[PDB]
Design a protein around this ligand. Structure first.
Ligand SMILES: CCCCCCCCCCCCCCCCCC(=O)OC[C@H](COP(=O)([O-])OCC(O)COP(=O)([O-])OC[C@@H](COC(=O)CCCCCCCCCCCCCCCCC)OC(=O)CCCCCCCCCCCCCCCCC)OC(=O)CCCCCCCCCCCCCCCCC
Ligand SMILES: CCCCCCCCCCC(CCCCCCCCCC)(CO[C@H]1O[C@@H](CO)[C@H](O[C@@H]2O[C@@H](CO)[C@H](O)[C@@H](O)[C@@H]2O)[C@@H](O)[C@@H]1O)CO[C@H]1O[C@@H](CO)[C@H](O[C@@H]2O[C@@H](CO)[C@H](O)[C@@H](O)[C@@H]2O)[C@@H](O)[C@H]1O
Ligand SMILES: CCCCCCCCCCC(CCCCCCCCCC)(CO[C@H]1O[C@@H](CO)[C@H](O[C@@H]2O[C@@H](CO)[C@H](O)[C@@H](O)[C@@H]2O)[C@@H](O)[C@@H]1O)CO[C@H]1O[C@@H](CO)[C@H](O[C@@H]2O[C@@H](CO)[C@H](O)[C@@H](O)[C@@H]2O)[C@@H](O)[C@H]1O
Ligand SMILES: CCCCC/C=C/C/C=C/C/C=C\C/C=C\CCCC(=O)O[C@H](COC(=O)CCCCCCCCCCCCCCCCC)COP(=O)(O)O[C@@H]1[C@H](O)[C@H](O)[C@@H](O)[C@H](O)[C@H]1O
Ligand SMILES: CCCCC/C=C/C/C=C/C/C=C\C/C=C\CCCC(=O)O[C@H](COC(=O)CCCCCCCCCCCCCCCCC)COP(=O)(O)O[C@@H]1[C@H](O)[C@H](O)[C@@H](O)[C@H](O)[C@H]1O
Ligand SMILES: CCCCC/C=C/C/C=C/CCCCCCCC(=O)O[C@H](COC(=O)CCCCCCCCCCCCCCC)COP(=O)(O)OCC[N+](C)(C)C
Ligand SMILES: CCCCCCCCCCCCCCCCCC(=O)OC[C@H](COP(=O)(O)OCCN)OC(=O)CCCCCCCCCCCCCCCCC
Ligand SMILES: CCCCCCCCCCCCCCCCCC(=O)OC[C@H](COP(=O)(O)OCCN)OC(=O)CCCCCCCCCCCCCCCCC
Ligand SMILES: CCCCCCCCCCCCCCCCCC(=O)OC[C@H](COP(=O)(O)OCCN)OC(=O)CCCCCCCCCCCCCCCCC
Ligand SMILES: CCCCCCCCCCCCCCCCCC(=O)OC[C@H](COP(=O)(O)OCCN)OC(=O)CCCCCCCCCCCCCCCCC
Lengths: 469, 89, 90, 485, 179, 91
């Protein structure tokens, strides 16, 4: 039903004028909502971890992958709401948050390529979907082409994605040269003992993982996330992370690997101490993604890691989404708007935010303490269920490095708080125009999920127990 | 396997130590894809099957589409800066 | 051309209430002395007197009362004892 | 019925906010209602039963919003014994006093402050109800963001660094607590304050588990390696933050060492009590000694609280019924007498002059005779001067620590001297001398300050004249944690 | 039991791998730099990198194998001592005595915490809880690590803890009974 | 050049490494050079028609991997839409 939307949409968008783009996005927003509501009853297919393979062992559909596609649709509904709804009706926010004509095309093609990775069984489906989503991130980065930083970022992302796609292709054909096969269903518990597939499968996982931003090769992605505009970067930070990690968690080819443990330790180290003395909010905000991708590289070492993974995925997705939406909302209160594409840059620009819209700071504080892992909030149970899998399986040094990394990362999370609860000289009293009803309801929904989502933990564990076991 | 391995390795190192212009980086990328093709098609011939030939005919098309995408990306890089630097982007 | 909105009406912050008259004459010397003592650690440096104090109170005294505490755990019972009876065990 | 009570009550709250700008009257009213409710619970409490009397489960799967009548239980349990209810009574009579303590000094944004203070009090109230390890741990760190916001927005010059330290050190010890809680929950597959003495772990698995819980207790009842956030988080807090902290958080970790460690780490605990005695004697002596050179005034009472908690830890770790009882009496009597001292330094002395350096204050008797009366009565009550409850706790804890090891009992008995040196050295400086040339004369102590002081002095004197009045709650729990085969 | 280490040859092998790692890192710093740089500025403007690699390698493996041969058992204490030696070598580039002592003690503590958890980045397979006997014993046996019982043997309590404090081989009750 | 030489030898040997199955490092390496044996080509008369290689690529792109061909159509569509979407400057 994504295919229908793309086929319908480029037909419809070629005939619309540029006056209609925003309304088109609104249409697609509601469309995706009724794909969630009217079509999710397909969860009844996946009782007792019943798994299907579709198109001749080409795609694999289990309940894990069903949850991942539900998550990707929910996030796309949020992001498309951010493009298709005005913040305010000023002549300001029209020249700032403006969609291009072909933006929603590339959005849906990227969601397609991201779904065909998690739903994938063979290696050429994996390859074709990786390049579909990679070309889509190239073009989503380059679509605001009236910008020096976004043009330079799209060129950098092209070359660094090209290398790490040729590394995946080399690993796939290298696997083919020793086994006349494409499946990891070929492996079946005995071949791994009598065959050295270590170097192959680890080079595959590494070429997949360096696109996330794991630690030796992290800086180019931090530069792409700082150079892209503020609406593009909330999408290109999230979607390759959850698609490629949901592939590599479903396929357990790096269990108890020494290289993945080295790079996970290094990722937790360099993300925690890397974003400490940093003064730009998207930089600060991208090293958070580096650490929280480290916590997934940990689960790659694991066998049977599907609870800790899926919980911490929807945790990180809601928290990520909310902390970018809060700093979208803080643009109304800053004394200095530069850089039309990226209107707030420096984290000291949100300095007096408690005296102008204090409940935005309540929002901010909730999602930042959930990033730290404070127990009434939803990020704590994510870190807790990761620890319950790390300690169950013998990773004892990894556990202490996780704890030290979370303690070090708490500093630059609280630096956002430390800036926003401060005195400011000229505070707001009376403002004529309002923030979007439709779009502030989304931020409040995302907060109420984070604070009051610990209620449903036992319900979620029981529904987990039936559909995955 | 020798010819594909060495074109991939020499192509990779020519990409890495490129400091002179930008289009050497593009053509080193394309020659990397050529070396991957060479290794795979040799394995398909040696194993007596089409499935390496299947992945090779698909990666031909994907290499073409990436060249089209990325060269339009270079053109948009060039729109606002009427020069391309020698040291790089 | 990017100026925050015309419809802001922003104005100055006050704490509010009553200005209590000054019950205390500040002393510049006492304030400088106390600000110097409160933040003593950011100007602290390792010397020989510092090293003497650090080894004597952080490693030497813990090792001493550690030796005493581990040597004397199940030694003494004094609960019901008489003349000519041991009060230690080992 | 019970939902209609609440949306009546939410409408009550909304209407009194609409007609009255402040909240503080309703927060006082809800605090005193909570008092009366806990004392009605104490009337219906069965002292003849060791078991947990008023049990309830939250967030079960069969009923996520509300109580649970089920064959299967995977939510969060709550319930009390006498040991829990002792600290609940101590908590609930302190919550209205901290809401009353800032009745006039917080001017700018009052409703935020009183909401934060009442919220911290409610979280610490529910800490003593909890019955899982994860249910204890969730409420055990719900306090920390509220403390961060409270210390950062309100305070002195340096309230940024104090708010950072109260998040940092507490979070850093309590993460290792979470490590040991996770290991317990994956070995036992149960976290429960009911069954957990029945399970026996291996000796070297116990000695691994015990370390992470003891590191968090060392951070939170601050023993000597990390005792260090405490003077700065006191010396730079607002008044109710300081009072709630030193009256309740330190005693909460004193409660956690009984509730969490002594039942299923017995065979570990016997191997480690000499190390606890090293650390607790070494945090009595060295902290009691480091108080003698202090220029600031709230920092002295912070270091005092360190030395008294160091006395209480060798009472709980004494393997004696006397030591357990004396540590409970010390925790309750300290939670009375120390917030009165923080009121003396932070309320009657910082509201009037807004400086906290010792060198300005001299000869306070001749303009403030009854403040000086309070200062000397509280100084002697803090020392270990008997008929006070502080001496009952210190005497029984020193006796238990003498039973478990007589030599560390002999060198721990000098805390009677060391605790009096700095306290009387401060008290005669404050009361004695010609009146200060820096201080201009202000008002004497007011009716609400005298009210708080009189309550916190009577409640030490009643425990000090008769410590038997709360033996009826504790005589089970004084026998419960003893491992003498 | 254990068998004594080759301090000679493991230290030679370590000096070889440190020399190679210094070669590779000096080449990497040469290639990733600005300014007039040629082929033999690799060892003049290196920043002293081969000294770091070889000195750490010789120091750690010499002190590790020597401490394991002097103590005649293998645990994490040897990693503590070897990390103290590595911190000494890394702290001597700091020509300052208190920073030297700080490098020694803190690197030794970090390496001892490393070597106490198993001295492995990755997991051990059979030592894991997933791949070990867990839960209750189903009938009475030697209780392993990761296992829970209801009652422990009292002889194990007397042998492991002691016969001192409140702990005895027969309870206080039946030691004092009327016949 | 020094890192060029180190990476040339290392990446070259390492690309030659993964065609081998030994526990042994340089038995992994020198089985890549054990090339000398001349394959024997036999005739079997089991195939009756001119199915050359392009015919079988057209059978398996179109029956067994038809979905790969249609996702590939989406990739070609993206290669149309993207370069247009960049370089137009709509009015
Ligand atoms: C409770 C928490 C406990 C944790 C405490 C740790 C923090 C201590 C901070 C020390 C400090 O001040 O350093 C500042 C110092 C900052 O430098 P600076 O600007 O030049 O000067 C600072 C002062 O002005 C200089 O003033 P100073 O010279 O007078 O101070 C003396 C000394 C004092 O430091 C002390 O703490 C001494 C304490 C000794 C008392 C012992 C009592 C025991 C009871 O501090 C130092 O100067 C240097 C200490 C060496 C730092 C070691 C860092 C690596 C250790 C491993 C950490 C992981 O830190 C560093 O430069 C260290 C380098 C940066 C990190 C590099 C990490 C390299 C990793 C090496 C390998 C690690 C192996 C890990 C095992 C993995 C196995 C595979
Ligand atoms: C074996 C250990 C040997 C102990 C030696 C003391 C030691 C290490 C202390 C480590 C403590 C370890 C604690 C335990 C572990 C915790 C980690 C510090 O030596 C300190 O000793 C002090 C007291 O003697 C001096 O203070 C004095 O106070 C006043 C008078 O009281 C005086 O008026 C005042 O002039 C002094 O400033 C300091 O100047 C001196 O730095 C090492 O000393 C040696 O190394 C260096 C510093 O590595 C020292 O200073 C350096 O050289 C200076 C030119 O000499 C340069 O200026 C500068 O390059 C640097 O300053 C040397 O001097 C040398 O002595
Ligand atoms: C801030 C606080 C820091 C706290 C860090 C504490 C970490 C201490 C780890 C202790 C622990 C993991 C337990 C962790 C459980 C939860 C941990 C919570 C998170 C911790 C993060 C790792 O034990 C490690 O200890 C090291 C030394 O202590 C060893 O080092 C190395 O030494 C030399 C190797 O031969 C090398 O030659 C040298 O190179 C190395 O150096 C390691 O080999 C060993 O694996 C113990 O596990 C293990 O214990 C053993 C013996 O009972 C269990 O034995 C089995 O069971 C019984 C019958 O079946 C039998 O009796 C027993 O015979 C049988 O074999 C195992 O089942 C296993 O489970
Ligand atoms: C870019 C564009 C494309 C460029 C292409 C040019 C280059 C092509 C070569 C391709 C390489 C691509 C690079 C890949 C990244 C590196 C990959 C890599 O190290 O994985 C290592 C290689 O495991 C070897 O067995 C170790 C392998 C040893 C290799 C020796 C190399 C010799 C060089 C001599 C000079 C994976 O071990 P691992 O971590 O699972 O560790 C194992 C562990 O060792 C075992 O004990 C356990 O059984 C197992 O559970 C696990 O714990
Ligand atoms: C189980 C898994 C968990 C799921 C958690 C669910 C999260 C999101 C669920 C959303 C479902 C939303 C239900 C809300 C429907 C009710 C609702 O508040 O109306 C919207 C928000 O409407 C969304 O924003 C609609 C947002 C739609 C998003 C759908 C996502 C699916 C807020 O209007 P509003 O009153 O402030 O404001 C309007 C408007 O401002 C004035 O012009 C008009 O005078 C008048 O109409 C006034 O009412
Ligand atoms: C008409 C409804 C239309 C469908 C709506 C679907 C939206 C997709 C949204 C995704 C992000 C929002 C979080 C929602 C979590 C849903 C939990 C869940 O149910 O996921 C299950 C467990 O998840 C797991 O293991 C682990 C999941 C971890 C969840 C952790 C977050 C907890 C707090 C937020 C969720 C509770 C909010 C409930 C508020 C009333 C696994 O998959 P299922 O086959 O059983 O799904 C069935 C859901 N159906 C029936 C609505 C289709
Ligand atoms: C998460 C968000 C959940 C919010 C739940 C709020 C429930 C409030 C219900 C009580 C009530 O009726 O309050 C209504 C009141 C009206 O709003 P008001 O701003 O006063 O309107 C003024 C118009 N001139 O509204 C209010 O009184 C404002 C209530 C704001 C609550 C802010 C809480 C900040 C954090 C407090 C400490 C954390 C508490 C959690 C830990 C315990
Ligand atoms: C800041 C971030 C941190 C904040 C975290 C705050 C945690 C808040 C958790 C809320 C806990 C709600 C528990 C309510 C229990 C109320 C109750 O027990 O009775 C009322 C009713 C259930 O009736 P009951 O008699 O218990 O049915 C079972 C009989 N065996 O149950 C009810 O109807 C109560 C319904 C409450 C709805 C509240 C929804 C959130 C509002 C905000
Ligand atoms: C027999 C065979 C003998 C083999 C010889 C041993 C070879 C070991 C490999 C040597 C690795 C060399 C590391 C290196 O390349 O040097 C660091 C490189 C240059 O750094 P530089 O230019 O000096 O940066 C300036 C900072 N101010 O800086 C870099 O950017 C390199 C990026 C990291 C390189 C990968 C690191 C892998 C290890 C992960 C860290 C492990 C963490 C463990 C905890
Ligand atoms: C990532 C970032 C990491 C940063 C690290 C910062 C420093 C961390 C704190 C320092 C921890 C140092 C730990 C050293 C432990 C060395 C060790 O392996 O201890 C093993 C020991 C059992 O050894 P055993 O063989 O039974 O007896 C030998 C008697 N000679 O076991 C014991 O005897 C118990 C030793 C307890 C030590 C407690 C230390 C405080 C906790």
């Amino acid at each position: 039903m994504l295919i229908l939307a793309i086929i319908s949409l480029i037909t419809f968008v070629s005939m619309s004028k540029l006056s209609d783009n925003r309304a088109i996005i609104r249409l697609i927003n509601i469309y995706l909502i009724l794909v969630l509501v009217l079509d999710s009853f397909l969860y009844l297919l996946f009782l007792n971890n019943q798994t299907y393979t579709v198109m001749g062992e080409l795609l694999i559909f289990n309940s894990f992958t069903f949850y991942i596609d539900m998550l990707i649709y929910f996030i796309m509904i949020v992001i498309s709401s951010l493009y298709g709804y005005n913040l305010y009706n000023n002549n300001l926010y029209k020249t700032l948050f403006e969609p291009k004509k072909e933006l929603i095309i590339l959005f849906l093609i990227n969601i397609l390529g991201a779904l065909l990775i998690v739903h994938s069984n063979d290696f050429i489906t994996l390859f074709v979907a990786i390049e579909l989503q990679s070309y889509s991130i190239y073009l989503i980065t380059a679509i605001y082409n009236s910008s020096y930083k976004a043009s330079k970022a799209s060129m950098l992302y092209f070359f660094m994605g090209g290398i790490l796609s040729i590394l995946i292709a080399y690993s796939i054909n290298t696997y083919y040269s020793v086994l006349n096969s494409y499946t990891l269903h070929s492996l079946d518990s005995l071949i791994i003992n009598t065959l050295d597939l270590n170097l192959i499968l680890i080079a595959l996982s590494l070429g997949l993982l360096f696109k996330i931003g794991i630690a030796p090769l992290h800086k180019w992605l931090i530069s792409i996330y700082e150079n892209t505009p503020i609406l593009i970067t909330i999408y290109i930070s999230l979607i390759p992370k959850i698609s490629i990690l949901s592939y590599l968690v479903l396929s357990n080819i790096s269990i108890n690997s020494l290289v993945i443990s080295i790079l996970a330790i290094l990722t937790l180290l360099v993300g925690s101490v890397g974003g400490l003395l940093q003064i730009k909010i998207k930089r600060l905000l991208a090293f958070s993604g580096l650490t929280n991708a480290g916590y997934m590289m940990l689960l790659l070492l694991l066998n049977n890691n599907e609870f800790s993974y899926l919980y911490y995925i929807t945790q990180y997705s809601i928290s990520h989404l909310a902390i970018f939406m809060i700093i979208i909302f803080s643009i109304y209160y800053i004394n200095y708007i530069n850089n039309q594409y990226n209107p707030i840059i420096y984290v000291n620009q949100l300095k007096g935010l408690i005296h102008d819209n204090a409940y935005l700071v309540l929002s901010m504080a909730i999602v930042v303490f959930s990033f730290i892992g404070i127990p009434p909030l939803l990020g704590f149970f994510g870190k807790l269920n990761i620890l319950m899998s790390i300690l169950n399986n013998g990773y004892y040094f990894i556990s202490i490095v996780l704890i030290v990394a979370s303690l070090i990362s708490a500093l630059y999370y609280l630096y956002l708080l430390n800036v926003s609860i401060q005195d400011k000289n000229n505070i707001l009293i009376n403002s004529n125009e309002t923030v979007s009803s439709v779009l502030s309801y989304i931020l409040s929904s995302l907060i109420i999920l984070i604070t009051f989502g610990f209620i449903y933990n036992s319900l979620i564990i029981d529904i987990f127990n039936v559909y995955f076991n | 396997m020798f010819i594909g391995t060495i074109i991939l390795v020499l192509s990779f190192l020519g990409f890495v130590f490129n400091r002179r212009n930008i289009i050497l980086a593009f053509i080193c990328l394309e020659t990397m894809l050529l070396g991957i093709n060479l290794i795979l098609l040799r394995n398909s011939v040696l194993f007596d099957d089409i499935s390496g030939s299947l992945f090779a005919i698909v990666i031909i098309i994907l290499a073409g589409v990436e060249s089209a995408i990325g060269l339009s990306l270079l053109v948009s890089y060039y729109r606002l800066r009427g020069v391309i630097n020698s040291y790089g982007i | 051309e990017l100026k925050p909105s015309s419809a802001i009406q922003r104005g100055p912050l006050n704490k509010g209430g009553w200005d209590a008259p000054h019950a205390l004459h500040n002393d510049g010397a006492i304030d400088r002395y106390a600000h110097w003592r409160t933040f003593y650690q950011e100007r602290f440096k390792y010397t020989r007197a510092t090293g003497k104090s650090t080894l004597i109170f952080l490693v030497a005294f813990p090792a001493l009362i550690g030796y005493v505490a581990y040597q004397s755990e199940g030694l003494f019972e004094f609960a019901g004892k008489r003349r000519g009876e041991s009060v230690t065990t080992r | 019925f019970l939902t209609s009570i609440l949306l009546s009550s939410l409408y009550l709250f909304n209407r009194i906010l609409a007609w009255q700008g402040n909240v503080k009257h309703f927060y006082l009213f809800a605090s005193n209602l909570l008092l009366l409710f806990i004392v009605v619970l104490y009337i219906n409490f069965n002292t003849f039963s060791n078991s947990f009397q008023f049990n309830f489960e939250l967030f079960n799967s069969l009923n996520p919003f509300g109580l649970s009548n089920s064959d299967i239980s995977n939510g969060l349990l709550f319930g009390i014994d006498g040991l829990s209810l002792t600290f609940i009574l101590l908590t609930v009579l302190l919550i209205p006093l901290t809401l009353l303590g800032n009745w006039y000094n917080i001017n700018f944004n009052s409703n935020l402050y009183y909401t934060l203070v009442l919220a911290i009090g409610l979280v610490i109230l529910l800490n003593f109800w909890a019955l899982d390890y994860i249910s204890f741990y969730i409420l055990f760190e719900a306090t920390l963001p509220l403390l961060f916001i409270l210390i950062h927005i309100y305070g002195s010059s340096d309230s940024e660094r104090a708010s950072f330290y109260v998040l940092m050190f507490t979070l850093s010890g309590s993460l290792f607590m979470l490590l040991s809680i996770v290991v317990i929950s994956i070995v036992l597959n149960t976290t429960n304050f009911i069954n957990h003495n029945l399970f026996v772990l291996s000796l070297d698995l116990q000695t691994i588990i015990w370390l992470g819980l003891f590191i968090a207790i060392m951070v939170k009842t601050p023993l000597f390696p990390i005792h260090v956030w405490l003077p700065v988080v006191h010396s730079e807090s607002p008044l109710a933050g300081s009072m709630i902290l030193a009256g309740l958080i330190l005693k909460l970790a004193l409660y956690a060492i009984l509730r969490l460690l002594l039942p299923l780490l017995c065979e570990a605990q016997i191997l480690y009590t000499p190390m606890i005695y090293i650390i607790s004697l070494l945090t009595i002596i060295l902290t009691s000694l480091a108080t003698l050179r202090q220029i600031d005034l709230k920092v002295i009472i912070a270091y005092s609280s360190i030395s008294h908690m160091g006395i209480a830890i060798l009472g709980v770790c004494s393997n004696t019924s006397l030591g357990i009882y004396g540590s409970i009496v010390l925790g309750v009597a300290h939670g009375f007498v120390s917030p009165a001292l923080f009121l003396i330094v932070g309320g009657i002395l910082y509201d009037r002059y807004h400086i906290r350096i010792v060198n300005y204050y001299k000869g306070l008797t001749t303009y403030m005779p009854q403040l000086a009366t309070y200062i000397i009565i509280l100084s002697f009550a803090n020392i270990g001067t008997p008929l006070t409850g502080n001496f009952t706790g210190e005497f029984l804890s020193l006796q238990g620590g003498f039973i478990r090891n007589p030599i560390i009992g002999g060198i721990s008995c000098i805390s009677v001297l060391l605790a009096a040196i700095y306290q009387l050295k401060l008290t005669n400086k404050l009361t004695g001398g010609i009146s200060s040339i820096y201080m201009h004369r202000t008002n004497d102590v007011t009716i609400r300050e005298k009210f708080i002081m009189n309550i916190l002095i009577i409640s030490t004197l009643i425990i000090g004249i008769c410590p038997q009045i709360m033996y009826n709650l504790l005589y089970w729990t004084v026998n419960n944690y003893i491992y003498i085969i | 039991h254990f068998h004594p280490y080759n301090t000679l040859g493991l230290a030679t092998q370590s000096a070889m791998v440190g020399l190679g790692a210094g070669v590779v890192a000096a080449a990497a710093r040469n290639s990733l730099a600005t300014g007039p740089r040629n082929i033999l500025t690799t060892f003049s403007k290196s920043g002293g990198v081969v000294t770091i690699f070889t000195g750490a390698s010789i120091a750690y493996v010499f002190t590790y194998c020597s401490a394991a041969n002097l103590r005649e058992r293998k645990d994490g204490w040897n990693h503590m001592w070897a990390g103290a030696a590595t911190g000494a070598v890394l702290g001597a580039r700091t020509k300052l005595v208190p920073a030297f002592i700080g490098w020694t003690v803190l690197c030794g503590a970090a390496c001892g915490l490393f070597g106490w958890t198993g001295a492995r980045f990755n997991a051990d397979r059979k030592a894991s809880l997933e791949q070990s006997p867990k839960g209750f014993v189903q009938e009475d046996a030697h209780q392993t690590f990761w296992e829970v019982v209801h009652r422990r043997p009292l002889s194990l309590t007397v042998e492991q803890l002691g016969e001192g404090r409140g702990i005895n081989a027969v309870p206080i009750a039946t030691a004092t009974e009327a016949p | 050049l020094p890192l060029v030489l180190i990476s040339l030898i290392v990446l070259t040997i390492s690309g030659l490494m993964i065609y081998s199955n030994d526990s042994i490092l340089i038995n992994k390496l020198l089985e890549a050079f054990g090339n000398d044996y001349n394959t024997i080509i036999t005739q079997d008369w089991f195939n009756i028609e001119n199915t050359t290689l392009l015919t079988t690529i057209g059978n398996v792109l179109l029956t067994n991997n038809a979905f790969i061909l249609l996702v590939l159509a989406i990739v070609l569509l993206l290669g149309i839409i993207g370069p247009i979407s960049i370089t137009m400057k709509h009015k």
